[model samples]
Target chain A: DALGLIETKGLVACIEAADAMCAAANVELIGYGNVGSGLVTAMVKGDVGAVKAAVDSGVESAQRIGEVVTSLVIARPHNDINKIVSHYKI
Target chain B: DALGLIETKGLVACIEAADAMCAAANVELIGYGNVGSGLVTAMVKGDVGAVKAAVDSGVESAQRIGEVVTSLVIARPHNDINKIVSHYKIT
Candidate 1:
């Protein structure tokens, strides 16, 4: 499975990213987090092609609302990473 | 009560800061988070004077191990913020 992650400066921005990503491609929001200093990050997973497209859409939407710190799409993440990300429920 | 927050670029850095803070002054480690992009943050609470001293010590220790993104000491943080911060579980 492919995983997409978007880190933003605000919580609302991450939500917008999640909404756009899901709408643009077949992806599921894995989780979101509030890293200190008001940073928020949202994670998603799906097919490689779909994950790439989803992250692009999500980044676009997030940038319009707030600063998008960083975004990434892992084509084939390690098994341990999959387990770690799967437990990120918040 | 005062709240001190330390944001770092690595999990190890935050742990180092937490240890130094607790050892330097009378402060309680409240919470911590792995905020993606390899970033980590640690929160502590104690007297205003103690928090300030603790944070200074923590920052120094963290910087020695990894990048310290930001650090702050809220002498009298708003009640709502306190409530919100209290629930930041790593899970």
Candidate 2:
């Protein structure tokens, strides 16, 4: 399966699961600046409970950086994960 | 022919030559923080004599930025050409 294929739902589930695990990993994703703004907008619009859970799960301390210049400039996990979740919602 | 692949050395050489074209592009690759530092170090060490030539050619940027980040983050051409030359001396 060198040219392996994966289902979209599988990808979504993996992301959903990762979001839950982020809490236990002590990893804080910054959620500010340009790309961060887009991310926060999505979370606030979707699940308030999940958002609250993320905050409570100790995924705090995430700060905003700057505008994402291109597709690859984004590195911070907070913005990164948010971008992923937002993409799927569309 | 439909699934052809290129040689690594050829690719390396291409990167080396791109260093000479960034000057006229109005670009300013940040050469300060994280990734920028590595680039600048390479440039300064690379043919210190060529520095004067490129600057005199007006290919050297007339501006400066903060710092270039990750390999993928370098969008500024002003400093890019220099980086290529820097890597080639050893490549």
TM-scores for candidates 1 onward, in order: 0.53, 0.17
- Cα error, candidate 1, residue A19 (Å): 0.5
Q: A1-90, model 2: which lDDT tens digit per residue?
A: 000001111111112222332343333222211122122111212133433444333222121112211121122235556564445332
Best by DockQ: 1
Q: Give i-RMS (Å) per prediction.
A: 9.9, 17.9
Report each candidate's C-alpha RMSD, comma-separated, in the order given: 10.5, 17.5
lDDT of 1 by residue, A49-69 (tens): 999999999999989989886
lDDT of 2 by residue, B1-91 (tens): 0000001112222223234323422222222111111222112122323333433222222112222211111112222123222222343
What candidate 2 gets wrong by more than 4 Å, as runs, is: A1-50, A56-59, A64-90, B1-91
Candidate 1, residue B6: lDDT: 91
Q: How many residue pairs clash in each candidate?
A: 0, 5
